[PDB]
Amino acid sequence: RDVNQLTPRERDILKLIAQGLPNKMIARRLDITESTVKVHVKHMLKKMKLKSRVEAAVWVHQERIF
Amino acid sequence: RDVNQLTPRERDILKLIAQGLPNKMIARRLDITESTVKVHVKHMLKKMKLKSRVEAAVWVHQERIF
Amino acid sequence: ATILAEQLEAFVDLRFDPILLRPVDDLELTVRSANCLKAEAIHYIGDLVQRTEVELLKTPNLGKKSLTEIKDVLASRGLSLGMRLENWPP
Amino acid sequence: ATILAEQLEAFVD
């Protein structure tokens, strides 16, 4: 239920990701293969029980949870 | 530039996009073909000079203007 | 007296379409397709067979491949889209 | 049975 069990740093990376950052630049910046980047975003997608980032980002912003 | 510079129609597509509805759901809601939605979104992309809907949505939500 | 007469009266007087109700689990679609159908309030075959191709195409997340799979599985069970039903519900 | 019911006719109702 609670996102904070995950690392805050990856949450900040994720906010940057939802700021329009494409996966290629993500892999280039984070020093991992694109496969690992996709695996990470896939993990975040199911762990938040979401189908798309738009609704989750809007919900995070509106109540200013983090 | 500014979201208020859009026409009431373009404001409607913009607000529907910011509400998280996908493009075909927008077509369903307004009872129009996908072509008109594509026309509106491509004009928004050209005028706002942006790459994706998510950046515009997050900028709209940033200032908590509503 | 009323009881006795009422009791004597016996001597004097006398001598669908199952496949439409089939659960969605029987449809054996892909997990994503089944999830999208349930999200679009498509839980019964009886309504589904009445619906048209374009309505399924207008579902935001389903593509031509999904339509192809659904058409193939309907054909393999002798069914298709847009069949007209009368006296609903069965 | 007809005869017997016919007798009770006066009381049935």
PDB file of C-alpha atoms in Angstrom:
ATOM      1  CA  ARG A   1       0.000   0.000   0.000  1.00  0.00           C
ATOM      2  CA  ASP A   2       2.811   2.346   0.996  1.00  0.00           C
ATOM      3  CA  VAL A   3       5.435   3.453  -1.505  1.00  0.00           C
ATOM      4  CA  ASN A   4       7.948   4.515   1.155  1.00  0.00           C
ATOM      5  CA  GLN A   5       9.027   0.907   1.702  1.00  0.00           C
ATOM      6  CA  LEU A   6      10.911   1.375  -1.569  1.00  0.00           C
ATOM      7  CA  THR A   7      13.983   3.580  -1.708  1.00  0.00           C
ATOM      8  CA  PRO A   8      13.370   7.342  -1.868  1.00  0.00           C
ATOM      9  CA  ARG A   9      16.210   7.680  -4.381  1.00  0.00           C
ATOM     10  CA  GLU A  10      14.474   5.439  -6.909  1.00  0.00           C
ATOM     11  CA  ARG A  11      11.300   7.433  -6.262  1.00  0.00           C
ATOM     12  CA  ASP A  12      13.159  10.623  -7.226  1.00  0.00           C
ATOM     13  CA  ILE A  13      14.558   8.842 -10.280  1.00  0.00           C
ATOM     14  CA  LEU A  14      10.979   7.774 -11.062  1.00  0.00           C
ATOM     15  CA  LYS A  15       9.668  11.326 -10.758  1.00  0.00           C
ATOM     16  CA  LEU A  16      12.380  12.275 -13.230  1.00  0.00           C
ATOM     17  CA  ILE A  17      11.209   9.358 -15.391  1.00  0.00           C
ATOM     18  CA  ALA A  18       7.594  10.562 -15.356  1.00  0.00           C
ATOM     19  CA  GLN A  19       9.090  13.945 -16.243  1.00  0.00           C
ATOM     20  CA  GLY A  20       9.355  12.550 -19.779  1.00  0.00           C
ATOM     21  CA  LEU A  21      12.686  10.779 -19.568  1.00  0.00           C
ATOM     22  CA  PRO A  22      13.045   8.095 -22.273  1.00  0.00           C
ATOM     23  CA  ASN A  23      14.392   4.660 -21.415  1.00  0.00           C
ATOM     24  CA  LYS A  24      17.533   5.042 -23.536  1.00  0.00           C
ATOM     25  CA  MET A  25      18.722   8.110 -21.620  1.00  0.00           C
ATOM     26  CA  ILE A  26      17.715   6.317 -18.414  1.00  0.00           C
ATOM     27  CA  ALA A  27      20.052   3.418 -19.190  1.00  0.00           C
ATOM     28  CA  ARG A  28      22.819   5.769 -20.324  1.00  0.00           C
ATOM     29  CA  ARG A  29      22.574   7.788 -17.100  1.00  0.00           C
ATOM     30  CA  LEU A  30      22.137   4.918 -14.633  1.00  0.00           C
ATOM     31  CA  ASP A  31      24.931   2.706 -16.087  1.00  0.00           C
ATOM     32  CA  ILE A  32      22.777  -0.391 -16.650  1.00  0.00           C
ATOM     33  CA  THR A  33      21.484  -2.118 -19.753  1.00  0.00           C
ATOM     34  CA  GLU A  34      18.128  -1.140 -21.210  1.00  0.00           C
ATOM     35  CA  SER A  35      16.861  -4.580 -20.201  1.00  0.00           C
ATOM     36  CA  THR A  36      17.489  -3.765 -16.541  1.00  0.00           C
ATOM     37  CA  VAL A  37      15.792  -0.373 -16.946  1.00  0.00           C
ATOM     38  CA  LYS A  38      12.701  -2.003 -18.427  1.00  0.00           C
ATOM     39  CA  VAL A  39      12.733  -4.625 -15.663  1.00  0.00           C
ATOM     40  CA  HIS A  40      12.877  -1.841 -13.072  1.00  0.00           C
ATOM     41  CA  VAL A  41      10.005   0.153 -14.578  1.00  0.00           C
ATOM     42  CA  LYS A  42       8.010  -3.070 -14.950  1.00  0.00           C
ATOM     43  CA  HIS A  43       8.613  -3.792 -11.274  1.00  0.00           C
ATOM     44  CA  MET A  44       7.455  -0.304 -10.320  1.00  0.00           C
ATOM     45  CA  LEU A  45       4.382  -0.750 -12.516  1.00  0.00           C
ATOM     46  CA  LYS A  46       3.142  -3.871 -10.718  1.00  0.00           C
ATOM     47  CA  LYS A  47       4.368  -2.858  -7.248  1.00  0.00           C
ATOM     48  CA  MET A  48       2.157   0.230  -7.402  1.00  0.00           C
ATOM     49  CA  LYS A  49      -0.728  -1.857  -8.812  1.00  0.00           C
ATOM     50  CA  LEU A  50      -1.019   0.564 -11.743  1.00  0.00           C
ATOM     51  CA  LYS A  51      -1.643   0.133 -15.458  1.00  0.00           C
ATOM     52  CA  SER A  52      -0.132   3.451 -16.635  1.00  0.00           C
ATOM     53  CA  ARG A  53       2.058   6.139 -15.098  1.00  0.00           C
ATOM     54  CA  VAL A  54      -0.300   9.040 -15.855  1.00  0.00           C
ATOM     55  CA  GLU A  55      -2.886   8.265 -13.178  1.00  0.00           C
ATOM     56  CA  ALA A  56      -0.252   7.407 -10.569  1.00  0.00           C
ATOM     57  CA  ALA A  57       1.732  10.592 -11.196  1.00  0.00           C
ATOM     58  CA  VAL A  58      -1.419  12.712 -11.035  1.00  0.00           C
ATOM     59  CA  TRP A  59      -2.478  11.054  -7.771  1.00  0.00           C
ATOM     60  CA  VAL A  60       0.987  11.567  -6.260  1.00  0.00           C
ATOM     61  CA  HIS A  61       1.027  15.242  -7.240  1.00  0.00           C
ATOM     62  CA  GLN A  62      -2.512  16.175  -6.182  1.00  0.00           C
ATOM     63  CA  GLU A  63      -2.228  15.174  -2.517  1.00  0.00           C
ATOM     64  CA  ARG A  64       1.540  15.890  -2.506  1.00  0.00           C
ATOM     65  CA  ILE A  65       2.201  12.584  -0.754  1.00  0.00           C
ATOM     66  CA  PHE A  66       5.971  12.687  -1.251  1.00  0.00           C
TER      67      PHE A  66
ATOM     68  CA  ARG B   1       3.623  28.598 -24.356  1.00  0.00           C
ATOM     69  CA  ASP B   2       0.595  29.115 -22.109  1.00  0.00           C
ATOM     70  CA  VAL B   3      -2.245  26.634 -21.672  1.00  0.00           C
ATOM     71  CA  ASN B   4      -4.806  29.458 -21.613  1.00  0.00           C
ATOM     72  CA  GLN B   5      -3.741  30.450 -25.146  1.00  0.00           C
ATOM     73  CA  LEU B   6      -5.643  27.418 -26.474  1.00  0.00           C
ATOM     74  CA  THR B   7      -9.129  27.498 -27.938  1.00  0.00           C
ATOM     75  CA  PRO B   8     -12.064  26.140 -25.891  1.00  0.00           C
ATOM     76  CA  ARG B   9     -11.889  23.026 -28.059  1.00  0.00           C
ATOM     77  CA  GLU B  10      -8.136  22.703 -27.531  1.00  0.00           C
ATOM     78  CA  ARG B  11      -8.755  23.405 -23.850  1.00  0.00           C
ATOM     79  CA  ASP B  12     -11.182  20.465 -23.820  1.00  0.00           C
ATOM     80  CA  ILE B  13      -8.666  18.066 -25.384  1.00  0.00           C
ATOM     81  CA  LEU B  14      -5.971  19.421 -23.050  1.00  0.00           C
ATOM     82  CA  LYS B  15      -8.091  18.889 -19.933  1.00  0.00           C
ATOM     83  CA  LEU B  16      -9.132  15.408 -21.066  1.00  0.00           C
ATOM     84  CA  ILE B  17      -5.444  14.569 -21.571  1.00  0.00           C
ATOM     85  CA  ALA B  18      -4.579  15.953 -18.126  1.00  0.00           C
ATOM     86  CA  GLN B  19      -7.400  13.817 -16.673  1.00  0.00           C
ATOM     87  CA  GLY B  20      -5.556  10.663 -17.771  1.00  0.00           C
ATOM     88  CA  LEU B  21      -7.925   9.452 -20.471  1.00  0.00           C
ATOM     89  CA  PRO B  22      -6.165   7.777 -23.418  1.00  0.00           C
ATOM     90  CA  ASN B  23      -6.582   9.126 -26.926  1.00  0.00           C
ATOM     91  CA  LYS B  24      -9.220   6.608 -28.012  1.00  0.00           C
ATOM     92  CA  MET B  25     -11.111   7.144 -24.759  1.00  0.00           C
ATOM     93  CA  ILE B  26     -11.058  10.852 -25.652  1.00  0.00           C
ATOM     94  CA  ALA B  27     -12.468   9.966 -29.078  1.00  0.00           C
ATOM     95  CA  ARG B  28     -15.206   7.912 -27.394  1.00  0.00           C
ATOM     96  CA  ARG B  29     -16.043  10.665 -24.903  1.00  0.00           C
ATOM     97  CA  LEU B  30     -16.422  13.387 -27.550  1.00  0.00           C
ATOM     98  CA  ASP B  31     -17.896  11.021 -30.191  1.00  0.00           C
ATOM     99  CA  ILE B  32     -15.330  11.832 -32.878  1.00  0.00           C
ATOM    100  CA  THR B  33     -12.937   9.846 -35.022  1.00  0.00           C
ATOM    101  CA  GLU B  34      -9.317   9.271 -34.068  1.00  0.00           C
ATOM    102  CA  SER B  35      -8.241  11.635 -36.854  1.00  0.00           C
ATOM    103  CA  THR B  36      -9.607  14.764 -35.167  1.00  0.00           C
ATOM    104  CA  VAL B  37      -7.976  13.757 -31.870  1.00  0.00           C
ATOM    105  CA  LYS B  38      -4.703  13.236 -33.749  1.00  0.00           C
ATOM    106  CA  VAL B  39      -5.086  16.652 -35.389  1.00  0.00           C
ATOM    107  CA  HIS B  40      -5.653  18.349 -32.034  1.00  0.00           C
ATOM    108  CA  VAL B  41      -2.801  16.522 -30.293  1.00  0.00           C
ATOM    109  CA  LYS B  42      -0.360  17.201 -33.132  1.00  0.00           C
ATOM    110  CA  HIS B  43      -1.231  20.908 -33.078  1.00  0.00           C
ATOM    111  CA  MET B  44      -0.681  20.919 -29.315  1.00  0.00           C
ATOM    112  CA  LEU B  45       2.654  19.167 -29.869  1.00  0.00           C
ATOM    113  CA  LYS B  46       3.668  21.698 -32.519  1.00  0.00           C
ATOM    114  CA  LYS B  47       2.544  24.825 -30.648  1.00  0.00           C
ATOM    115  CA  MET B  48       3.792  23.758 -27.209  1.00  0.00           C
ATOM    116  CA  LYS B  49       6.944  22.275 -28.811  1.00  0.00           C
ATOM    117  CA  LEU B  50       6.748  19.280 -26.480  1.00  0.00           C
ATOM    118  CA  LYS B  51       7.542  15.585 -26.796  1.00  0.00           C
ATOM    119  CA  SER B  52       4.823  13.907 -24.708  1.00  0.00           C
ATOM    120  CA  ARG B  53       1.531  14.517 -22.927  1.00  0.00           C
ATOM    121  CA  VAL B  54       2.964  13.644 -19.512  1.00  0.00           C
ATOM    122  CA  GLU B  55       5.298  16.650 -19.320  1.00  0.00           C
ATOM    123  CA  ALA B  56       2.450  19.035 -20.116  1.00  0.00           C
ATOM    124  CA  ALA B  57       0.206  17.310 -17.574  1.00  0.00           C
ATOM    125  CA  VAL B  58       2.793  17.499 -14.790  1.00  0.00           C
ATOM    126  CA  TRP B  59       3.493  21.167 -15.556  1.00  0.00           C
ATOM    127  CA  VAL B  60      -0.246  21.856 -15.415  1.00  0.00           C
ATOM    128  CA  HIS B  61      -0.459  20.152 -12.022  1.00  0.00           C
ATOM    129  CA  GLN B  62       2.749  21.733 -10.658  1.00  0.00           C
ATOM    130  CA  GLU B  63       1.447  25.190  -9.759  1.00  0.00           C
ATOM    131  CA  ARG B  64      -1.811  23.848  -8.253  1.00  0.00           C
ATOM    132  CA  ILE B  65      -3.676  26.564 -10.125  1.00  0.00           C
ATOM    133  CA  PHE B  66      -7.028  24.774  -9.809  1.00  0.00           C
TER     134      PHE B  66
ATOM    135  CA  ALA C   1     -68.420 -29.046   6.420  1.00  0.00           C
ATOM    136  CA  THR C   2     -66.210 -26.699   4.419  1.00  0.00           C
ATOM    137  CA  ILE C   3     -63.191 -28.911   5.005  1.00  0.00           C
ATOM    138  CA  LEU C   4     -64.996 -32.071   3.987  1.00  0.00           C
ATOM    139  CA  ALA C   5     -66.387 -30.610   0.766  1.00  0.00           C
ATOM    140  CA  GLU C   6     -63.072 -29.039  -0.234  1.00  0.00           C
ATOM    141  CA  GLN C   7     -61.470 -32.403   0.412  1.00  0.00           C
ATOM    142  CA  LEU C   8     -63.988 -34.340  -1.695  1.00  0.00           C
ATOM    143  CA  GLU C   9     -63.444 -32.058  -4.686  1.00  0.00           C
ATOM    144  CA  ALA C  10     -60.633 -34.355  -5.890  1.00  0.00           C
ATOM    145  CA  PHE C  11     -63.017 -37.262  -6.479  1.00  0.00           C
ATOM    146  CA  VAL C  12     -65.713 -35.265  -8.231  1.00  0.00           C
ATOM    147  CA  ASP C  13     -63.366 -33.289 -10.434  1.00  0.00           C
ATOM    148  CA  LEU C  14     -60.705 -35.681 -11.719  1.00  0.00           C
ATOM    149  CA  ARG C  15     -61.948 -39.200 -12.046  1.00  0.00           C
ATOM    150  CA  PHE C  16     -32.249 -21.727 -24.543  1.00  0.00           C
ATOM    151  CA  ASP C  17     -28.675 -20.644 -25.340  1.00  0.00           C
ATOM    152  CA  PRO C  18     -26.315 -22.036 -22.675  1.00  0.00           C
ATOM    153  CA  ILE C  19     -23.198 -20.833 -24.498  1.00  0.00           C
ATOM    154  CA  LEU C  20     -24.185 -17.197 -23.924  1.00  0.00           C
ATOM    155  CA  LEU C  21     -24.253 -17.696 -20.137  1.00  0.00           C
ATOM    156  CA  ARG C  22     -20.852 -19.397 -20.184  1.00  0.00           C
ATOM    157  CA  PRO C  23     -18.379 -17.709 -17.807  1.00  0.00           C
ATOM    158  CA  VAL C  24     -15.604 -15.597 -19.292  1.00  0.00           C
ATOM    159  CA  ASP C  25     -13.037 -18.036 -17.886  1.00  0.00           C
ATOM    160  CA  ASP C  26     -14.271 -20.614 -20.405  1.00  0.00           C
ATOM    161  CA  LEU C  27     -13.296 -18.195 -23.187  1.00  0.00           C
ATOM    162  CA  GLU C  28      -9.585 -19.035 -22.695  1.00  0.00           C
ATOM    163  CA  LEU C  29      -8.361 -15.636 -23.874  1.00  0.00           C
ATOM    164  CA  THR C  30      -5.032 -14.044 -23.014  1.00  0.00           C
ATOM    165  CA  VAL C  31      -4.751 -12.689 -19.479  1.00  0.00           C
ATOM    166  CA  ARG C  32      -4.403  -9.126 -20.753  1.00  0.00           C
ATOM    167  CA  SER C  33      -7.392  -9.518 -23.078  1.00  0.00           C
ATOM    168  CA  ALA C  34      -9.572 -11.012 -20.341  1.00  0.00           C
ATOM    169  CA  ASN C  35      -8.530  -8.262 -17.928  1.00  0.00           C
ATOM    170  CA  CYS C  36      -9.341  -5.563 -20.486  1.00  0.00           C
ATOM    171  CA  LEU C  37     -12.727  -7.137 -21.236  1.00  0.00           C
ATOM    172  CA  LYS C  38     -13.560  -7.238 -17.528  1.00  0.00           C
ATOM    173  CA  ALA C  39     -12.422  -3.617 -17.205  1.00  0.00           C
ATOM    174  CA  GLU C  40     -14.799  -2.748 -20.072  1.00  0.00           C
ATOM    175  CA  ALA C  41     -17.695  -4.411 -18.183  1.00  0.00           C
ATOM    176  CA  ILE C  42     -17.696  -7.351 -20.622  1.00  0.00           C
ATOM    177  CA  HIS C  43     -18.445 -10.302 -18.345  1.00  0.00           C
ATOM    178  CA  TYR C  44     -21.133 -12.221 -20.267  1.00  0.00           C
ATOM    179  CA  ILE C  45     -21.130 -13.878 -23.674  1.00  0.00           C
ATOM    180  CA  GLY C  46     -24.798 -12.980 -24.149  1.00  0.00           C
ATOM    181  CA  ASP C  47     -24.095  -9.260 -24.357  1.00  0.00           C
ATOM    182  CA  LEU C  48     -20.719  -9.791 -26.038  1.00  0.00           C
ATOM    183  CA  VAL C  49     -22.150 -11.607 -29.066  1.00  0.00           C
ATOM    184  CA  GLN C  50     -24.577  -8.702 -29.523  1.00  0.00           C
ATOM    185  CA  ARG C  51     -21.740  -6.172 -29.668  1.00  0.00           C
ATOM    186  CA  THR C  52     -20.070  -5.076 -32.895  1.00  0.00           C
ATOM    187  CA  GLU C  53     -16.501  -5.107 -34.159  1.00  0.00           C
ATOM    188  CA  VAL C  54     -15.968  -1.334 -34.032  1.00  0.00           C
ATOM    189  CA  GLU C  55     -17.008  -1.159 -30.377  1.00  0.00           C
ATOM    190  CA  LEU C  56     -14.304  -3.702 -29.539  1.00  0.00           C
ATOM    191  CA  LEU C  57     -11.895  -1.709 -31.714  1.00  0.00           C
ATOM    192  CA  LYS C  58     -12.797   1.449 -29.772  1.00  0.00           C
ATOM    193  CA  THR C  59     -11.604  -0.205 -26.571  1.00  0.00           C
ATOM    194  CA  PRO C  60      -8.526   1.885 -25.754  1.00  0.00           C
ATOM    195  CA  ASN C  61      -6.022  -0.899 -25.038  1.00  0.00           C
ATOM    196  CA  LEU C  62      -7.121  -3.686 -27.413  1.00  0.00           C
ATOM    197  CA  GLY C  63      -5.493  -3.876 -30.823  1.00  0.00           C
ATOM    198  CA  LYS C  64      -6.029  -5.623 -34.147  1.00  0.00           C
ATOM    199  CA  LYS C  65      -4.196  -8.653 -32.758  1.00  0.00           C
ATOM    200  CA  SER C  66      -6.723  -8.876 -29.920  1.00  0.00           C
ATOM    201  CA  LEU C  67      -9.577  -8.675 -32.424  1.00  0.00           C
ATOM    202  CA  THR C  68      -7.925 -11.410 -34.493  1.00  0.00           C
ATOM    203  CA  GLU C  69      -7.600 -13.706 -31.472  1.00  0.00           C
ATOM    204  CA  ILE C  70     -11.205 -13.100 -30.399  1.00  0.00           C
ATOM    205  CA  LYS C  71     -12.526 -13.706 -33.917  1.00  0.00           C
ATOM    206  CA  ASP C  72     -10.489 -16.909 -34.255  1.00  0.00           C
ATOM    207  CA  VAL C  73     -11.669 -18.314 -30.924  1.00  0.00           C
ATOM    208  CA  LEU C  74     -15.286 -17.386 -31.713  1.00  0.00           C
ATOM    209  CA  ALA C  75     -15.027 -19.090 -35.111  1.00  0.00           C
ATOM    210  CA  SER C  76     -13.508 -22.203 -33.519  1.00  0.00           C
ATOM    211  CA  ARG C  77     -16.673 -22.339 -31.368  1.00  0.00           C
ATOM    212  CA  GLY C  78     -19.020 -21.507 -34.243  1.00  0.00           C
ATOM    213  CA  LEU C  79     -19.706 -17.975 -33.008  1.00  0.00           C
ATOM    214  CA  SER C  80     -18.945 -14.437 -34.133  1.00  0.00           C
ATOM    215  CA  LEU C  81     -19.730 -10.834 -33.254  1.00  0.00           C
ATOM    216  CA  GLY C  82     -22.959  -8.929 -33.752  1.00  0.00           C
ATOM    217  CA  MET C  83     -25.547 -11.701 -33.455  1.00  0.00           C
ATOM    218  CA  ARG C  84     -29.058 -10.429 -32.769  1.00  0.00           C
ATOM    219  CA  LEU C  85     -30.833 -11.740 -29.672  1.00  0.00           C
ATOM    220  CA  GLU C  86     -34.527 -11.688 -28.797  1.00  0.00           C
ATOM    221  CA  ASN C  87     -36.347 -12.054 -25.465  1.00  0.00           C
ATOM    222  CA  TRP C  88     -33.412 -10.867 -23.311  1.00  0.00           C
ATOM    223  CA  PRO C  89     -32.416 -12.132 -20.886  1.00  0.00           C
ATOM    224  CA  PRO C  90     -32.487 -15.873 -21.774  1.00  0.00           C
TER     225      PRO C  90
ATOM    226  CA  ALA D   1     -68.734 -37.962  -4.178  1.00  0.00           C
ATOM    227  CA  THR D   2     -71.237 -35.767  -5.994  1.00  0.00           C
ATOM    228  CA  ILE D   3     -74.040 -36.999  -3.753  1.00  0.00           C
ATOM    229  CA  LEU D   4     -72.115 -36.381  -0.555  1.00  0.00           C
ATOM    230  CA  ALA D   5     -70.971 -32.897  -1.547  1.00  0.00           C
ATOM    231  CA  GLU D   6     -74.539 -32.147  -2.574  1.00  0.00           C
ATOM    232  CA  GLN D   7     -75.618 -33.000   0.964  1.00  0.00           C
ATOM    233  CA  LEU D   8     -73.034 -30.672   2.497  1.00  0.00           C
ATOM    234  CA  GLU D   9     -74.071 -27.868   0.128  1.00  0.00           C
ATOM    235  CA  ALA D  10     -76.371 -26.267   2.696  1.00  0.00           C
ATOM    236  CA  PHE D  11     -73.474 -25.675   5.085  1.00  0.00           C
ATOM    237  CA  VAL D  12     -70.417 -25.117   2.904  1.00  0.00           C
ATOM    238  CA  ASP D  13     -71.099 -21.386   2.593  1.00  0.00           C
TER     239      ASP D  13
END
